[PDB]
Amino acid sequence: QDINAQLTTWFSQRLAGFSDEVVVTLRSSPNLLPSCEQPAFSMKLWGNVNVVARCANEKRYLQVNVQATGNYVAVAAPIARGGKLTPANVTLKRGRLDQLPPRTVLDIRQIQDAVSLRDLAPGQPVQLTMIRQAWRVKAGQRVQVIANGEGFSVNAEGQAMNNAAVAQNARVRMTSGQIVSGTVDSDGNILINLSSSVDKLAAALE
Ligand SMILES: [Cl-]
């Protein structure tokens, strides 16, 4: 029961913070098990995984099944496409992590300012493919364009032409109809960082 106890302890410690119940089952032939007392294990965190087990003169490829139970983010109330994920409509549920659909959110902090891309039903695990970050800037919104660099500062008002989250690109129509583009910041401003532009900016003032 040596290898089974060692693998159980190894995956339990590796899964600290993800799971409080880790069960390991060997799927490969016991004839290909490491011979040494303390094999070095190395490596997907759970489910059907391959583990390399090294001993002096051995490099075993073990196939194991890892059952890991812990918390994951699930839908707690109906959420419409475009609906904000809140503490009223998404919660932590306890379940078999190894049976979850791909890219299920495990940490409730990952869903802060998230918005649903789909109509979601209660009990559904929240997957990264079902959600997006909220729009800090929305199409048609009055925004501030801030350009800085080479002893120059420009502050101008415009209308956001597209929806954009923080750190995403936003095109902005200036009052004349000229379109500029920059990065959305936490304040909903559009940031531009400035070779001929600093020369062009000064030339515009002439
Ligand atoms: Cl949004």
Author numbering: 1 to 43, 48 to 198, 202 to 213
Structure paper excerpt:
FlgA is a periplasmic flagellar protein that chaperones P-ring formation. FlgA possesses a typical signal sequence at its N-terminus, recognized by the Sec-dependent pathway, suggesting that FlgA functions as a P-ring assembly chaperone in the periplasm. P-ring formation is a key step enabling the bacterial flagellum to pass through the outer membrane.
To gain insight into the regulatory mechanism of P-ring assembly by FlgA, two different atomic structures of FlgA from S. enterica, the open and closed forms were solved. Atomic models were built from amino acid residues Q1 through L198 (numbering corresponds to the mature protein) for the open and closed forms and refined at resolutions of 1.95 Å and 2.3 Å, respectively. For the open form, a segment from T44 thorough A47 was not traced in the final model due to the poor quality of the electron density map in this region. While the structures of corresponding domains are similar in the open and closed forms, the D1 domains of the two forms align with an RMSD of 0.64 Å, while the D2 and D3 domains align with RMSDs of 0.35 Å and 0.33 Å, respectively. Based upon the structural difference induced by crystal packing, we tested whether the closed and open forms were possible in solution. FlgAR113C-S190C is locked in one conformation, while FlgA adopts intermediate structures upon immobilization, suggesting that FlgA might exist in the periplasm as a flexible intermediate structure, or in equilibrium between the open and closed forms defined here. Perhaps FlgA switches conformations from the closed to the open form after interacting with cellular components or other flagellar proteins.
